[PDB]
Design an enzyme around this catalytic site. Structure first.
Site, mmCIF file in Angstrom:
data_model
loop_
_atom_site.group_PDB
_atom_site.id
_atom_site.type_symbol
_atom_site.label_atom_id
_atom_site.label_comp_id
_atom_site.label_asym_id
_atom_site.label_seq_id
_atom_site.Cartn_x
_atom_site.Cartn_y
_atom_site.Cartn_z
ATOM 1 N N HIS B 65 47.958 11.411 -5.939
ATOM 2 C CA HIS B 65 46.636 11.612 -5.247
ATOM 3 C C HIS B 65 45.960 10.457 -4.875
ATOM 4 C CE1 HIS B 65 46.966 15.689 -6.847
ATOM 5 N NE2 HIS B 65 46.443 16.272 -5.745
ATOM 6 N N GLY B 109 50.502 14.061 -9.081
ATOM 7 C CA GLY B 109 50.939 14.632 -8.087
ATOM 8 C C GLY B 109 52.174 14.437 -7.411
ATOM 9 N N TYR B 139 43.899 20.338 -14.089
ATOM 10 C CA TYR B 139 45.195 20.534 -13.000
ATOM 11 C C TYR B 139 45.370 21.924 -13.230
ATOM 12 C CZ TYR B 139 48.940 18.553 -10.474
ATOM 13 O OH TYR B 139 50.126 17.946 -9.756
#
Ligand SMILES: CC(C(=O)SCCNC(=O)CCNC(=O)[C@H](O)C(C)(C)COP(=O)(O)OP(=O)(O)OC[C@H]1O[C@@H](n2cnc3c(N)ncnc32)[C@H](O)[C@@H]1OP(=O)(O)O)=[N+]([O-])[O-]
Ligand SMILES: CC(C(=O)SCCNC(=O)CCNC(=O)[C@H](O)C(C)(C)COP(=O)(O)OP(=O)(O)OC[C@H]1O[C@@H](n2cnc3c(N)ncnc32)[C@H](O)[C@@H]1OP(=O)(O)O)=[N+]([O-])[O-]
Ligand SMILES: CC(C(=O)SCCNC(=O)CCNC(=O)[C@H](O)C(C)(C)COP(=O)(O)OP(=O)(O)OC[C@H]1O[C@@H](n2cnc3c(N)ncnc32)[C@H](O)[C@@H]1OP(=O)(O)O)=[N+]([O-])[O-]
Ligand SMILES: CC(C(=O)SCCNC(=O)CCNC(=O)[C@H](O)C(C)(C)COP(=O)(O)OP(=O)(O)OC[C@H]1O[C@@H](n2cnc3c(N)ncnc32)[C@H](O)[C@@H]1OP(=O)(O)O)=[N+]([O-])[O-]
Ligand SMILES: CC(C(=O)SCCNC(=O)CCNC(=O)[C@H](O)C(C)(C)COP(=O)(O)OP(=O)(O)OC[C@H]1O[C@@H](n2cnc3c(N)ncnc32)[C@H](O)[C@@H]1OP(=O)(O)O)=[N+]([O-])[O-]
Ligand SMILES: CC(C(=O)SCCNC(=O)CCNC(=O)[C@H](O)C(C)(C)COP(=O)(O)OP(=O)(O)OC[C@H]1O[C@@H](n2cnc3c(N)ncnc32)[C@H](O)[C@@H]1OP(=O)(O)O)=[N+]([O-])[O-]
Ligand SMILES: CC(C(=O)SCCNC(=O)CCNC(=O)[C@H](O)C(C)(C)COP(=O)(O)OP(=O)(O)OC[C@H]1O[C@@H](n2cnc3c(N)ncnc32)[C@H](O)[C@@H]1OP(=O)(O)O)=[N+]([O-])[O-]
Ligand SMILES: CC(C(=O)SCCNC(=O)CCNC(=O)[C@H](O)C(C)(C)COP(=O)(O)OP(=O)(O)OC[C@H]1O[C@@H](n2cnc3c(N)ncnc32)[C@H](O)[C@@H]1OP(=O)(O)O)=[N+]([O-])[O-]
Ligand SMILES: [K+]
Ligand code: NI
Ligand code: NI
Ligand code: NI
Lengths: 260, 260, 260, 260, 260, 260
Positions: B65, B109, B139
């Site tokens: 991310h 991610g 998450y």
């Protein structure tokens, strides 16, 4: 203080040590009540990681369900309020990681107990047996499900159908264990990983743990399926074989199972 | 052409190479939108297999991310139409095999993204980390579920709760990777597997991939349990710890998490 | 008592040996019907464990689906009452453990068949392939589900998308097999385990097996998702590629698939 | 005692009377917290049946959600720990029957609250409306589910899409209500039924009530479907129409909805 | 022939008439075993529709469970293979329509039995009650589920929590019954409909009935929810209230329930 | 413009009127394709509510499936992409309310189609029949499920097993219809309600309709149960009776069904 556990705290890590060596840490009701009280007492913000262990040098980590506390016949031996059923739920719902640090031999419901925990780090000399088919006990769906999230079906069926012990090395290879270390390195290897987890975001760890718990339980069936299984379990706890398995354990002899 | 990816086709095999090295192939919206357009554009009958890769010699496969796209406000950055959530669905629903060919370090991610793909072939020097507990990120359920179909629960929890990297050799041993190859052999090993797949029946591959996708999603729960999890996630997003995790990463310092 | 199998009973263990070697134990209806009859006939209290095997020395354990029984005009050959679908249900519902004792090469439907069994013990020279993408067959949901309970998703997709054989050593490493032994040790190793299982409580074994079967099946979906998948499967059965895959197998030539 | 409810006990029956006439029994946090405390206080063995009511003669039973408490900021006003969400869960989990005894007009959240109760007995003059489409509120899954267990889908969709009031006679005919009574007989009739229930076996009532609760909730979906619905609901609470509906309600004017 | 039922066939319709009037057609094992034998005997292609009835002029259609066959305490009274549980499955799985033609009063398990049938046609003087809370019986999940597919939740809860009889007219109004007719017209009306059904496509009726059965069953839950419910039921069948409920029925007196 | 429908919009309400009376608005592919195109064309922000209707004075609202388009070769006629299957999904997914405004008789698939819509308003002279058992058609799970959300199971089984017509008054009493009005009030009553709905918040209506759709579909089953049902439906479409049913309809005579 507790009659049947000893607790030590190192920074943000709590270590719960079994103190029931007189029955080889069998999961008796009074032992599990103290283990559950000790966990509840440690559910505070400045504790971030739990380790469960047997005393240093233990031959037996835990002898599993207290066989003397199983019912004599005609009653479900693994009902929702049974101590093994309570402790696995409480470990799985506890909002901090619980690491099983294993020295010695692990039996039956104690194997399910460590499987229910988040991580397992074990001595190279530790062994693991799943033993209800030695006693003729109809294990419950939740209990069996708790055994299926690490190793594959074929491996789980070998463990349960043979009731044969596996080594730490084999338990690592098949996915049951996280790490295997020499027994002299076990405590400090486990604590190093517990202190590292203890510097991470505890609210994130808790919600991710709960997400994994509900995803793990999300194998759904209809009521008829469940009642059918429960009727099969009842035929087993009503069987002559269940009485034989209990009696053979009491008389310290090999059971003679006949299939009724 | 595309600003943030490069595409090469070798007969039936297409290679999508990241072109965002300035930002270590962080999962910024503009990068993910280009990867999705490139994949959409390759959904053609004469293409039979996709490889996703970073450029040859990449130290970082993907940094995960983009911190600068993570809202400090209420807003959940893992909502349904966030780019990481879109591209994992698109990879899973894509009617051709997608192979992640990994050189360098994989984070957060980007780990979920390769886990969502069909096969992972990695360099012996590649490494893998799952990092939301470093920032206090709650998450999301779908995202966690995407990490549970390869390695067992104890291994997943060790990865997520420690946020510690594992080697390619350990990722192979626990079931995350298909193959580990020396970096000089990685491209040829991966291409020969992709060309081999491309000689098989594409409509059969597509329906069996889709059957696997829907079986993998078929962990079902009631509305109350989903809404209860969302409440827990929102409490994490509203926490002081979540602010501290994001500020610490932006300010290049160790966060001080306190559990509210 | 059976044309296409031979049965030997050693104490409480029954060994069912394939006797269809002139067709490499291909899953012809007449063979599978005799296998199911011999298994049914063994559902008696004094039988505690089953071994399935090919004859000693077999190069091919089973060649999988019989091409001559594969319907050209329309008919799904993986419908609910097709022989492979019947024998996998019968194996999974059978109240005794069933061990696949593997010598030789295992192909396609025969791979699903041994995966449906409780344990797999294999010779070091045995090999394993899943082959429907070689013929353009849209393998059915239940059949694919039967392949997902041992190795992880990435591995399963490599096996299915490549249709490439894997060694016994790789099948052990990924969790498909329980044990790999030298071919000279296969009978002794397998019978020692089977005799050991036969000492245990059969009713506890039966109800645990059935609990695992229902938990394994408890990936639930709505009617629309099922019907959508069946429409995709019908489109593959109606494809030119499906005709090409069967015709190429029958003509002993490489298929040329085109994606319609 | 409680600031916002009055409790009377008559042998085994407890009557909880709303005392929030100042805001026509709108489901403000302070009113719902007192209602939940009163229920909790009545969870004792010698109480067997609860009645919920507005004061005798009331024109308004409850005006529904307090709109001065529905946030016009960003947050979901129907999150898991919103007062309406808490009180419906508490009513459904309460191990005694809860009877809604209705005199007056019932609005929006108050309609969901009485629908979550076990029985509804109403005055011939009482009226019923479900009003989120008046304000542009994206009602939550659990909340909608709670309106689907009595009347059919077409009837529910008319109630929600029109937001029009129905009579007590129509609510009886479509299956929402148990009984319709003249207002001067409402209390006598309801108390007679409550005393009668209180003569039955409480442990059987509690377990059958819980069995119905879990069957009621057993409409299960996967994580992706829940997240997809969550993203649709967020788009609604981020809309111009949501701001317009809340503002139009506060300003006592008709809203102008535009579909963004 | 049968000791406890009389069967007549008229063209393609079979009428199974109860012959256990001396015990008010209570659901004794000997009666249910005969009813199930009669049904199995009628599973023939020349039979198209079944009618279940009591003798003409019966005051009591069925007095429900034989309370002499209720186990004394510590034992589940509604296990999978108990006669009422067997006959409701058999009715539901039977590949022909089964029409309950009701004259007289219907109680408890007999109410569940007719609810499990496909259509109910009743005399204007017939009455219906569901009585387990009169005895303290923890009714099982499948049995309660069988009561929820016709009338709404509030109506079902009134029936079970009060144990009060409802009229044929109210049972028609709330969706329990298909038709109510004067007793003199009951046989001719029901036979006309059964003959009508008997000219329709039996294989289409059979698969649509089965589709309805499995859709009606398809309320799914996880194992922990099921085992939690079973634990609650066991606490009820272990209760002093359950013993008191059975004793009061045998001593023909009003029970005194106390909540343990 | 459309060949088989006429569309009139005023303000925010669109009326789609069937223009296929020469074939009694039979659900031919060309007719359903035009209805779906007209609905798609109306998916615009300024349209808020749809009415489906037959022309004023219609004796037959819709004759249901075109028997000329039902395959006699062994194709499932209710496959996922059959026009009736497409239009029921499209109506249910459509983000605006769809009102069926019924004048005349409603048959088979047309009955399913109006049941899939959000509200039904009917003339007092309208009639409703569900007819697959007249032809021997094995109606599909999704289609049967679409008939189960309004009336109870007993009523639904009467409708299907008898194929007998019910009046608007009975359709109202059993919960199928929202309103029954005299035919001369049908347009005015329906337009009043549609324009009333169009003043409400469209994004709230759209997400609540979608929540209802998902909850309505959330009856989940395992793959084996669906494949078992599929096998049963295939045996029905392979039946002598299915051929007889289609032949009798084409020849304008009564079928003679035999149960093969
Ligand atoms: C969930 C579940 C279960 O967990 S069933 C319980 C499964 N547990 C087991 O199979 C382990 C049984 N125990 C053993 O195999 C052996 O006792 C061990 C654990 C290897 C230890 O062997 P040892 O030779 O060192 O010690 P030993 O056998 O002498 O046992 C030490 C004492 O603890 C007693 N004991 C051992 N395991 C016990 C247990 N699980 N419950 C109750 N007592 C136990 C044993 O009877 C003896 O009593 P006594 O002092 O009155 O003679 N289930 O479904 O069945
Ligand atoms: C539903 C489905 C299908 O129906 S697939 C249909 C075809 N089956 C498969 O693709 C499964 C994988 N099996 C295979 O690829 C091949 O059977 C094997 C493993 C390569 C071996 O084939 P080979 O040509 O080497 O066999 P070989 O020449 O050694 O053959 C020895 C004998 O077995 C016969 N035979 C071999 N495989 C056979 C098969 N799959 N079906 C029928 N007969 C077979 C062959 O005709 C010959 O008998 P004959 O002398 O009377 O004619 N599905 O999912 O894949
Ligand atoms: O291993 P590779 O990387 O070469 O891939 P792959 O074998 O799939 O390319 C297909 C080759 O593997 C063969 N094969 C497939 N399954 C097999 C098994 N279970 N055992 C032995 N050989 C097998 C297959 O028939 C074909 O043989 P062939 O050499 O006559 O074509
Ligand atoms: O069909 P209708 O024309 O009755 O629908 P409509 O929504 O207009 O509703 C008629 C009136 O009843 C009001 N209403 C809504 N729910 C209500 C309830 N449970 N009881 C009484 N009135 C209600 C609604 O505000 C409207 O108010 P207003 O007249 O003050 O503006
Ligand atoms: C779950 C949900 C909902 O529940 S939406 C809310 C649905 N409720 C409504 O539309 C009903 C709103 N209220 C009304 O329509 C009218 O107040 C009533 C029920 C018809 C009766 O009219 P009345 O002339 O008798 O009384 P009045 O309107 O004056 O209201 C009496 C007092 O209660 C206040 N009040 C009434 N409804 C209220 C509400 N929903 N929220 C907060 N305050 C409210 C109002 O501001 C006034 O306080 P004040 O003295 O401080 O000004 N949802 O998400 O959509
Ligand atoms: C599934 C379930 C249940 O079924 S609960 C219990 C459901 N059963 C009931 O509620 C029915 C209770 N029974 C009664 O109220 C009454 O016996 C009748 C049906 C209502 C009507 O009142 P009556 O005055 O006519 O009773 P009646 O005097 O006619 O009794 C007629 C004959 O039938 C026998 N009998 C009646 N009810 C019986 C029962 N429940 N079990 C066994 N025998 C019974 C009784 O012993 C006598 O035989 P005998 O002459 O050899 O002694 N559950 O979980 O709760
Ligand atoms: O209306 P109700 O007044 O009958 O309500 P309630 O629950 O009191 O029960 C009314 C009376 O009908 C009896 N009853 C219960 N279920 C019944 C049924 N299906 N048919 C006829 N009577 C019934 C119940 O035993 C009671 O008789 P009892 O006089 O011996 O107590
Ligand atoms: S397989 C799904 C089953 N579908 C149905 O059950 C609809 C059954 N249709 C009927 O009962 C009747 O045909 C209707 C709906 C009541 C109307 O009867 P009417 O007396 O008003 O007109 P009639 O039946 O004579 O119908 C006029 C024409 O429309 C034809 N027709 C009626 N329904 C049809 C359908 N669903 N598919 C194809 N043709 C149909 C009928 O065969 C006749 O053919 P023809 O011109 O070639 O001879
Ligand atoms: K046979
Ligand atoms: Ni799973
Ligand atoms: Ni007592
Ligand atoms: Ni439902």
């Amino acid at each position: 203080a507790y009659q049947y556990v000893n607790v030590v705290t190192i920074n943000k890590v709590a270590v719960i040590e079994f103190n029931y060596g007189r029955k080889l840490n069998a999961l008796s009701k009074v032992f599990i009540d103290d283990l559950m009280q000790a966990l509840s007492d440690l559910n505070r913000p400045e504790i971030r990681c739990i380790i469960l262990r047997a005393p240093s040098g233990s031959k037996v980590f835990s002898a599993g369900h207290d066989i003397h506390e199983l019912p004599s016949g005609g009653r479900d031996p693994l009902s929702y309020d049974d101590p093994l059923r309570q402790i696995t739920r409480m470990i799985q719902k506890f909002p901090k990681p619980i690491i099983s640090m294993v020295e010695g031999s692990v039996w039956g419901g104690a194997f399910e107990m460590i499987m229910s925990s988040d991580l397992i780090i074990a001595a190279s000399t530790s062994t693991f047996s799943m033993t209800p088919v030695n006693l003729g006990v109809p294990y419950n769906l939740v209990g069996i499900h708790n055994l299926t999230r690490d190793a594959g079906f074929h491996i789980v069926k070998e463990l349960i159908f043979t009731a044969s012990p596996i080594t730490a090395q084999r338990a690592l290879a098949v996915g049951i264990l996280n790490h295997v270390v020499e027994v002299e390195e076990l405590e400090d290897f486990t604590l190093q990983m517990a202190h590292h987890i203890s510097e991470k975001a505890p609210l994130a760890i808790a919600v991710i743990k709960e997400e994994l718990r509900v995803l793990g339980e999300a194998h759904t069936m209809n009521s008829d399926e469940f009642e059918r299984i429960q009727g099969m379990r009842r035929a087993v706890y009503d069987s002559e074989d269940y009485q034989e398995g209990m009696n053979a354990f009491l008389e310290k002899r090999k059971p003679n199972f006949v299939g009724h």
